[PDB]
Write a protein that binds this ligand. Structure first.
Ligand code: P4O
Length: 283
């Protein structure tokens, strides 16, 4: 019998409680994210501002609901304040200062198949928690995967519920759109990039749409000469173009390559080299 607390929106001016700076930490689907400090504590936090409406009530609503998961960025407090005669929802969340995921990676002196497995599994856990309570994230990308700290054992967290949406014989207990499969695809793209340092669908750009729709990608050598068939096969079931043909977050979490991160080869990948070597067109 497990029950967690509900969301208590705070109404006092948020500055009573935090020093708000203008340093920008990230950009969201519907608000930027400033650095702020707890005036009473000097500790740092991230603040995302949204104009109260209902699209925003939802982000807060859903994100709060998901905030329990270890791999989802934790919401510290939510204020409803007045800002320029407009009413605002201000979300204060823990501060992920360890950087985005692909950046920690692109900064070393070698990345291993195994490390990739390990990373995929944490992203997987985030998605699995979300799907298990009927939230599709609908926007899992690299920019939304931040590390909690620079320390080498920091935690990977998922962010930005800007597009997060609810989703409600299993097909009798309530219909349900492809909404989740959307995440499983993202998951496949990230896993792809993790293993080789570039995305499976290239630009060169009316043809990128079409290679995406057609499902045209390869596992080119060198970068992949060393990677398991077992793995390519996994990537392949994620990047299926037919949503319903696509693997589910449960099958993914049970697939051996993920299930047993430590039973995975420490084989080296090119990812880190390729990620520097491409810092440019990485936009
Ligand atoms: O909801 C979001 N949508 C868009 C991207 C984003 N970043 C954040 C965020 C949340 C917490 N911390 C950070 C953050 C903190 N510290 C950083 C230091 C250096 C680089 C990036 C950092 C990001 C960003 C939230 C969201």
């Amino acid at each position: 019998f497990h029950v967690k607390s509900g969301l208590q929106i705070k109404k006092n001016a948020i500055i009573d409680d935090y020093k708000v700076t203008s340093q920008v930490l990230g950009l969201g689907i519907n608000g930027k994210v400033l650095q702020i400090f707890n005036k009473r504590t000097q500790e740092k936090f991230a603040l995302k501002m949204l104009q109260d409406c209902p699209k925003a009530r939802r982000e807060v609503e859903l994100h709060w609901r998901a905030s329990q998961c270890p791999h989802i960025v934790r919401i510290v407090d939510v204020y409803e304040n007045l800002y320029a005669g407009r009413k605002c929802l201000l979300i204060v969340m823990e501060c992920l200062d360890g950087g985005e995921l692909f950046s920690r990676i692109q900064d070393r002196g070698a990345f291993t198949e195994r490390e990739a497995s390990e990373i995929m599994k944490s992203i997987g856990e985030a998605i699995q928690y979300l799907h298990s309570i009927n939230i599709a994230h609908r926007d899992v990308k690299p920019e939304n995967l931040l590390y909690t700290s620079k320390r080498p054992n920091a935690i990977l967290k998922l962010t930005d519920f800007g597009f997060a949406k609810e989703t409600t014989a299993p097909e009798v207990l309530g219909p349900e759109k492809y909404d989740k499969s959307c995440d499983m695809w993202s998951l496949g793209v990230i896993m792809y990039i993790l293993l080789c340092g570039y995305p499976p669908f290239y630009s060169n750009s009316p043809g990128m749409k079409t290679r995406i729709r057609m499902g045209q990608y390869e596992f080119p050598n060198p970068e992949w000469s060393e990677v398991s068939e077992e793995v390519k096969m996994l990537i392949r079931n994620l990047l299926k173009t037919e949503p319903t043909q696509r693997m589910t977050i449960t099958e993914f979490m049970n697939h051996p390559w993920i299930m047993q991160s430590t039973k995975v080869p420490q084989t080296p990948l090119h990812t880190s080299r390729v990620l520097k070597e491409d810092k440019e067109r990485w936009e």
